[PDB]
Design a protein around this ligand. Structure first.
Ligand code: NDF
Ligand code: NDF
Ligand code: MG
Ligand code: MG
Ligand code: MN
Ligand code: MN
Lengths: 307, 305
């Protein structure tokens, strides 16, 4: 037989499956009205991809060379890992850590040089919040979705990175409107209600550093006069899931979607996502704080049930 | 405690810290379609709009004008001895969930019975002429666009003050419009299911004898098997907290809906309903569009039983 909690989880999954809840990424060829977006996607916590939605001048123009020419060879913040897994699991001396990227400043031209050097470490630029570049985007074009959130973005992120930079599976407390400018992004998505199918562990936290001789290593993170820090993190690799180690993952129904230059992906709050991309892909995305209702509380309960 | 109980405690603590479903929002002006979808539908959040509707029917519609308009047609009416149609009642030391006595009656006789304080409790309930012109259903478009489909049911209700609707839930989005008088709702949010005691009761129906006496007649299925119904056990108006201490953690909401007011009652919200004498109301039921919230609620049902 099954335990009470197991039967309850089985009910949740069976009901979602029969009702096709979060069982696909809706695909649209035209931008919906704000009311359509609110009814069909925001209110249903349902992801959607709109093809060739944006005609921003950035799309088809922005490249690393174009950005160097447009903004000069200025110093930007860059993230570096030896393995391509910033905010990702990696082992050292027999111990598995959740590892943060090495963050540094370097000149855009040097970033371009290291992007052209796959014998070297994996790099990507990230910028969170430009008179030469604000002209190339029209944020108001996303109003059709923003009107469901009825608030300005918490954050606007710019990403430009190596094809080897993989973002391991996580979720965010934001509504995410994701716009690819150049190249393509590959998303693996898992709906929140399938949490019981996604194994999670508790891991010592580390950060990448380079030794005096240039070798990468993992430095554990410690608080002032105190012990090691820990992070809960998804432990499955959606590209190579170990179903012997994580049989429950066999019951997940991951969704795969490719977002091209000019496409918009609405990634709803608390959806698990794992992200890859083409080489020198460029993207911008908009994070809005979520509006709490009973789904968040049910998700917290689901967390308690799967601990 | 058990794992299930700790899970339910986590749920309730989170919802209480966020005050999910802690009040019925009050509007003095009909919102836009987009406002309604974003603030209320997508949040499974009730809302009452004051003096929203100016239909001719508001103010005019009373039993006398109705008799005039329909030529005293014979209507289907529900009768109970206690005023609790679809409600619990004891007979022979056993507690049944009782359906109403369903009969046919001239509107004039219904009006006469409503005026009898010593008589049984009557109410007219009619579910789908010159009356259609007294309404303007398109005025509810602001809500219908969130449902994106025509009403799956439209109900008319005219009733005695003693008719009380015991606490229950519906799998419908409900747009409730009071025509004459007022309705009093007690609401409990779905996520508080574990605070609402429910029991399994044998099904029964009210019937009158040859001498005019109400009794409870058991029901059965196709065979002679006894029929059962799950039903909320607590009386919100005077809850037995000794027998049902968990209900102390529920936080019911009281709202009075006057003539011209609109109440949006979201799907699966518990509601207990009273009304003023000869109250008239019309409501619109829309089948729900299943999302993850419904599946969470089905899980919650499995856990609390
Ligand atoms: O937009 C996101 O939430 C997200 O996970 N973006 C990732 C990169 C990223 C990683 C970490 C923080 C912000 C953004 C991507 O590969 O596009
Ligand atoms: O509209 C409802 O869902 C509802 O429970 N209405 C109650 C009575 C009722 C009971 C059953 C069917 C329709 C209406 C009222 O007093 O208006
Ligand atoms: Mg794995
Ligand atoms: Mg009681
Ligand atoms: Mn993310
Ligand atoms: Mn009801």
């Amino acid at each position: 037989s099954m335990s009470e909690v197991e039967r309850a989880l089985d009910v949740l999954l069976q009901e979602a499956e029969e009702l096709c809840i979060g069982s696909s990424v809706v695909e649209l060829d035209r931008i919906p009205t704000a009311l359509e977006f609110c009814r069909e996607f925001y209110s249903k916590n349902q992801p959607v991809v709109i093809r060739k939605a944006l005609n921003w001048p950035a799309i088809g123009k922005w490249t690393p060379k174009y950005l160097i020419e447009a903004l000069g060879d200025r110093s930007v913040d860059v993230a570096i890992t030896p393995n391509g897994y910033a905010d990702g699991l990696a082992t050292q001396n027999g111990q598995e850590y959740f590892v943060l990227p090495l963050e540094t400043k370097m000149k855009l031209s040097e970033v371009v040089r290291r992007l052209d050097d796959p014998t070297g470490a994996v790099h990507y630029i990230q910028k969170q919040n430009l008179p030469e570049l604000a002209a190339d985007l029209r944020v108001s074009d996303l109003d059709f979705a923003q009107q469901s959130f009825n608030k300005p973005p918490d954050a606007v992120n710019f990403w430009l990175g190596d094809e080897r930079a993989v973002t391991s599976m996580h979720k965010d407390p934001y509504e995410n409107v994701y716009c690819v400018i150049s190249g393509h992004k590959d998303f693996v998505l898992i709906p929140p209600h399938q949490l019981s199918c996604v194994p999670r562990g508790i891991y010592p936290t580390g950060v990448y550093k380079t030794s005096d001789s240039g070798q990468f290593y993992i430095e554990p993170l410690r608080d002032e006069e105190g012990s090691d820090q820990f992070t809960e993190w998804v432990s499955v690799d959606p590209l190579s899931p170990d179903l012997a180690k994580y049989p429950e993952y066999a019951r997940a129904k991951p969704l795969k979607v490719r977002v091209h230059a000019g496409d918009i992906l609405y990634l709803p709050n608390y959806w698990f996502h794992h992200v890859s991309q083409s080489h020198k892909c460029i993207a911008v995305n908009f994070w809005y704080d979520l509006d709490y209702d009973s789904r968040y509380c049910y998700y917290r309960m689901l967390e308690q049930m799967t601990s």
